[PDB]
Amino acid sequence: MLLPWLILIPFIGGFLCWQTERFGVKVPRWIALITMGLTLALSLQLWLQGGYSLTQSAGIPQWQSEFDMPWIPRFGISIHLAIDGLSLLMVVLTGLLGVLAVLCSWKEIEKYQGFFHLNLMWILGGVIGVFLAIDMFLFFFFWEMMLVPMYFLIALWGHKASDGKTRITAATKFFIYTQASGLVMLIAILALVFVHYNATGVWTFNYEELLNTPMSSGVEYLLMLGFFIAFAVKMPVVPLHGWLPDAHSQAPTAGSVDLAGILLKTAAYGLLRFSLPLFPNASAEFAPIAMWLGVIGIFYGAWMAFAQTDIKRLIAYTSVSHMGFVLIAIYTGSQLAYQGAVIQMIAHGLSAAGLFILCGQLYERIHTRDMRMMGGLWSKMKWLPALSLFFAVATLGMPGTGNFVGEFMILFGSFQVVPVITVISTFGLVFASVYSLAMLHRAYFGKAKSQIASQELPGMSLRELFMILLLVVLLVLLGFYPQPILDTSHSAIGNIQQWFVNSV
């Protein structure tokens, strides 16, 4: 009975940010900050009062909190929200990144900034709704409801140095990819619901009731394929990764929309909740193909990230490789690999969010993004190159940061399942180190390759430094003491894994 407020506080806050622009041009940033602070504090309240650490695995379904309300009773569709440890971790993560995205868009005081904050909070509310929806139609509705504000934020408030048509092309390509994947998901959902209706005789879109639906091997494989295509576009999984570097590069130059919509990965959670339990035999049959796609994604993203002359495209391909690691973790049958996948998702979110914030600060300081044109910037700034070195160290897979923890439990569980793919993924870790060193070399080390690089740049403000240091502290504490996160996710992950293993 608290989750609808988790979804509706961002929407009401976005409406208030649009409406309060007439009171003052610098008003709606404060309203967005207050609403995202309320959402984050309420997520932390759900964490504190949920008692997730003492919760054991009991089998799907098992929700710490729930809410049901009829929406389209002709089809048996209800607004049905449910929270357990995994969804709560993702909701806390998107609340924190929403606060960071509001704080990152500070000191951008222009006309129609209230609308910018409106699409920001609508994206974040859609992300929360994706995490909390446990029925197919509302999950698809939030899956595709986030994309219109994302499209308009990319296309209208995007990179001001772009042609104006390149932003349109990137936003349209991203929208077409995500919406076509969503429509394939809707076909799979509809066919699953119709198979359930033919089997029993009732109409329902509910995930608890759609579980244990009897179907043949080919039908289950096709439904798995539709779900996996939808989740493979948004993870991204190669060759469906083409939207992500173009969307990241042409996004607003603050970087707030990256953290709000593109950086957070609902596709791995979607695979965990709606692909392994619903079609476990089909997922077991598809596991070699998905794990090899994850291997190819890791190495492809590494080779792309080394070859990029732009920072934002480089970080986008880092995201591609890290979600290749997560996709390898998903299709195993180990609880250790899944727990590492959860840690990897959270830590990659924090690390790449810090990377995108620092790239936005670097661009707002030096007004370029070409790595071949700047260099030797350690001596020219106060705080930015050291923090960028730390975040490249974190994305490199270094102990003391949560990324190492995440991908190493991923590799431990995967080796317990499949040794060869683990071997090739560890060589992918070598490649990740390679591109991190290459970005650090081409960006901050050496002699300055242009006159703007050979000039003294003002230091970062208290706000940007404080939020980057908050990200740093969170990453270090996750690296050294990951036990609260593992204890929160343990019950949900045990439910998903125990469902996946004995039904095949």
Binding site: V405, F408, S433, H441, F445
Partner: protein, 601 residues
């Protein structure tokens, strides 16, 4: 006891304070903060050793917290302390304090003073984590930490891109080694369910009663990680290039911390290696080949630092030969003595470079023995210790113990390889010394001077109880082995005096010959290993990165948009605006519909 956490925390506190100062403090304040943190770590290490020897040398455990706990996967954040860990902690803290004081003198008036001291404090904290680790994963934390600090310290002078290229080459080769170590970790956890060293030793013999292939692969992968970190065959190509940074950094890496991590890994996991004798024999063979190749390569080099690099490579090969003949006590004693005299040699070479200017070749300078007397004495003592000069130098006792362990286990080929290596070590050491030196009493230099003599050989590590006892040789064989080592050393010394001290006609005639030039250009480039690694790994990686730099999968997924656009342009040809064509199209569609209805029926 229970102050190991202080020995980790105080370098960390120094690192945080010196990083967050970012140059705002004075050089004196940053110097005393960094040097005081390391010195207090060394003093707490001294108190720890006093408390360890006060008791009956019992192994102590301080479990701080639990790192990760997922089902059976229980990796803990615990610190263990025995004779081996006490030896490594004392070596790291003392040699790091000496190097820190020397660098506090040496870095005056340079950019990034506090950054340098923060990086070195993080280096010392990471190595203390590595040597005090209770399990394999905390040792992996220290492994990656010392690799990262090696990268951050080799490229300290970041403005020169060659320093950056050297630092990232070092980081990539070490990361390949740590991937091999991760393979060892995965195999050991999959087979035994734990990564604690004592637990692995306990549950190893029961689990591998039928098949020993997985334990063999685990020990082989541990060997791969060890030779990655210690710069041995075949991952040794980074150590020569690793002197782009300062000479205190090179002293720390080659003596105190970095190259000795593989020896600690092999010695700590000796219980697993004893059940796989073939892998331990491979460790010995790899060390022998590495020391031979390093001795051949250091004979032709024209830099002080690179000669000292291949000297460090040959000494680490001696340690690996000692580990391969199950002479563990000899290996750790040689680690102590080699850390002492290699820190002495690197600080003396740093003073030689600073006294000179522009970092010149060794062939340009000669007769520097009168220019700097004290640095000449330091370099002479370090060279005598490195060349294993008998009865005065600790290196003689260390190499004698290694060779006695090789004889007592029936290893003749490894013995003669060690003898040839000692001959070549004396050869290149006094070749370099007689080339650079022929033709203000700082206290770290004095302490390293004292420790490089037999005074350092008087200190015996408390390895009785941790590592197995080396088998004892007969007295006559032991005496004639000392005699053979002494005459081999002095024959090398007098040959190096005969060739490079004087008119140098014979050595120039040999170098000017076509086989002589071919051998010199072969051994100058580390036997072609850097070239082979470039042409096998770096060039195809760059070729694939250039081939893929315009995303081929993005084009292979964007061709549906091209097909859609082409189909739309083609279909728009029918909308020509001609009414007669519209009537013709309606009649054509009527014909098609009627024909389809008659065909389908």
């Amino acid at each position: 006891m229970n102050m190991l956490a202080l020995t980790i925390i105080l370098p960390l506190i120094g690192f945080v304070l010196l990083a967050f100062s970012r140059g705002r403090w004075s050089e004196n304040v940053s110097a005393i903060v960094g040097v005081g943190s390391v010195g207090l770590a060394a003093l707490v290490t001294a108190f720890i050793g006093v408390d360890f020897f006060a008791n009956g040398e019992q192994t102590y455990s301080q479990p701080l917290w639990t790192w990760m706990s997922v089902g059976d996967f229980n990796i803990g954040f615990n610190l263990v302390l025995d004779g081996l860990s006490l030896t490594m902690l004392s070596v790291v803290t003392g040699v790091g304090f000496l190097i820190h004081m020397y660098a506090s003198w040496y870095m005056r008036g340079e950019e990034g003073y506090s950054r340098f001291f923060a990086y070195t404090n993080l280096f010392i904290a990471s190595m203390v984590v590595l040597v005090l680790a209770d399990n394999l994963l905390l040792m992996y934390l220290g492994w990656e930490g010392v690799g990262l600090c090696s990268y951050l310290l080799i490229g300290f002078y970041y403005t020169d891109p060659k320093n950056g290229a050297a630092a990232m080459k070092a980081f990539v080769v070490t990361r390949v080694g740590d991937v091999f170590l991760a393979f060892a970790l995965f195999i050991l956890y999959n087979e035994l369910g734990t990564l604690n060293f004592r637990e692995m030793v306990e549950l190893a013999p029961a689990h591998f009663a039928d098949g020993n292939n997985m334990l063999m692969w685990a020990t082989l992968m541990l060997l791969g990680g060890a030779v990655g970190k210690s710069a041995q065959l075949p991952l040794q190509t980074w150590l020569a290039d690793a002197m782009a940074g300062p000479t205190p950094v090179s002293a720390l890496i080659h003596a105190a911390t970095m190259v000795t991590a593989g020896v600690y890994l092999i010695a700590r996991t000796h219980g697993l290696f004893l059940m796989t004798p073939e892998v331990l024999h491979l460790v010995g063979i790899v060390g022998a080949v590495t020391l031979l190749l390093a001795g051949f390569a250091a004979l032709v080099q024209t830099d002080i630092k690179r000669v000292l690099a291949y000297s460090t490579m040959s000494q680490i090969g001696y340690m690996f030969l000692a580990l391969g003949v199950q002479a563990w006590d000899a290996a750790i004693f040689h680690l102590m003595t080699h850390a002492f005299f290699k820190a002495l040699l690197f600080l003396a070479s740093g003073s030689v470079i600073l006294a000179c200017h522009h970092e010149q070749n060794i062939f340009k300078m000669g007769g520097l023995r009168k220019s700097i007397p004290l640095v000449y004495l330091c370099f002479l003592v370090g060279g005598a210790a490195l060349s294993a000069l008998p009865l005065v130098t600790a290196g003689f006792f260390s190499k004698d113990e290694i060779l006695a362990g090789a004889m007592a286990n029936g290893h003749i080929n490894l013995m003669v390889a060690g003898l040839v290596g000692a001959f070549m070590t004396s050869l290149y050491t006094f070749r370099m010394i007689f080339i650079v030196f022929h033709g203000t009493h700082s206290l770290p230099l004095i302490v390293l001077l004292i420790l490089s003599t037999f005074v350092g050989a008087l200190i015996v590590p408390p390895l009785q109880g941790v590592l197995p006892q080396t088998t004892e040789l007969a007295h006559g064989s032991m005496l004639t082995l000392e005699i053979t080592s002494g005459v081999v050393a002095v024959v090398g010394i007098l040959l190096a005096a005969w060739l490079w001290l004087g008119k140098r006609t014979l050595v120039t005639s040999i170098a000017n010959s076509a086989p002589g030039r071919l051998l010199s250009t072969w051994w100058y480039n580390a036997w072609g290993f850097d070239w082979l690694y470039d042409k096998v790994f770096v060039k195809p990686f760059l070729g694939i990165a250039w081939l893929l730099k315009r995303d081929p999968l993005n084009s292979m997924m964007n061709i549906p948009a091209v097909l859609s656009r082409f189909a739309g342009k083609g279909l728009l040809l029918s909308e020509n605006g001609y009414l007669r064509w519209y009537v013709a199209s309606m009649s054509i569609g009527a014909v098609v519909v009627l024909a389809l209805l008659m065909v389908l029926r």
